[PDB]
């Protein structure tokens, strides 16, 4: 089977175009047809572009489609406008969906996220539990990629990250929680909470005691 | 066979026969008759069913 690649998110100002590419892992893209879809928050997905270069009835043009081979990828091109098209787009070829790219208008000025790593409390360690608390805030847009590595390899066991959501100051907030045991807490030298936001990576590391 | 025989000595009749049950042989022979003007009388075998 193949696998579909989409960028996590992208930001574009009104009056300018934006391109998002759907990439096929194995095999050629032209071997099968591809489709593009949009989904508003809480709204059912709606067809926007189907069968490579074909506009469904009701689609007001603008949204074109590139199916050139290139690096085994097919991209989606949108005319310059930011009225409502700020949504998440997915590519589907054959029983496989795309990752999805978040698109939003350029509103408030972008703010760098604030990374803070909280080592597990001693009282929790007494209860044979270890929770790693990582908090993020003052960032735009609400899309943060957070990864956890035990100083020698990424760790995905017990990780728990809150979905970003709009704050009360036209901003976004989120947090990441990692659940571990005292044996795992004391087994590794340090644990890292990497934060990725709009291509910006901020690293904060903590050590036991 | 049929039209090479026709191309050989000039026959006028091709009294025929068979041993199978494939009804399709009747239609093929009927097609032979149209474009060659040779009377043919199938008797026994596949070329028997009306």
């Amino acid at each position: 089977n193949f696998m579909l690649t989409q960028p996590h998110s992208v930001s574009e100002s009104p009056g300018k175009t934006v391109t998002i590419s759907c990439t096929r892992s194995s095999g050629s893209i032209a071997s099968n047809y591809v489709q593009w879809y949009q989904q508003r928050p809480g709204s059912s997905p709606t067809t926007v572009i189907y069968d490579d270069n074909q506009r469904p009835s009701g689609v007001p043009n603008r949204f074109s489609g590139s199916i050139d081979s290139s690096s085994n990828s097919a991209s989606l091109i949108i005319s310059g406008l930011k009225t409502e098209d700020e949504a998440d787009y997915y590519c589907q070829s054959t029983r496989v969906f795309g990752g999805g790219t978040k698109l939003t208008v350029l509103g408030q000025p972008k703010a760098a996220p604030s990374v803070t790593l909280f080592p597990p409390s001693s009282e929790e360690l007494q209860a044979n539990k270890a929770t790693l608390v990582c908090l993020i805030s003052d960032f735009y847009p609400g899309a943060v990629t957070v990864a956890w590595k035990a100083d020698s390899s990424p760790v995905k066991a017990g990780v728990e990250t809150t979905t970003p959501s709009k704050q009360s100051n036209n901003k976004y907030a989120a947090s990441s929680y990692l659940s571990l045991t005292p044996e795992q807490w004391k087994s590794h030298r340090s644990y890292s909470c990497q934060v990725t936001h709009e291509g910006s990576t901020v690293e904060k590391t903590v050590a036991p005691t | 066979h049929v039209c090479d025989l026709m191309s050989g000595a000039r026959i006028h009749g091709l009294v025929f026969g068979d041993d199978t049950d494939q009804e399709a042989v009747a239609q093929m022979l009927d097609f032979i008759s149209s474009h060659t003007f040779v009377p043919i009388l199938g008797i026994h075998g596949g070329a028997s069913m009306i």
């Binding site: 071997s31 099968n32 | 097609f31």
Partner: protein, 49 residues
């Protein structure tokens, strides 16, 4: 697998869409079980031919 489908269609220009259309069907139906092929031939003169 290789399920070849033929035709006795008219002049080769009309046959061109046949070779084009099958790939479209191949593109639509996605599996490694349905790899069709194509062949054709024009209307030769005479009936026996």
């Amino acid at each position: 697998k290789i399920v070849n489908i033929g035709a006795v269609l008219s002049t080769r220009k009309h046959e061109q869409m046949f070779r084009e259309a099958v790939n479209q069907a191949n593109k639509r139906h996605g599996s490694w079980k349905i790899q069709l092929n194509a062949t054709s031939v024009t209307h030769k003169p005479n009936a026996i031919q």
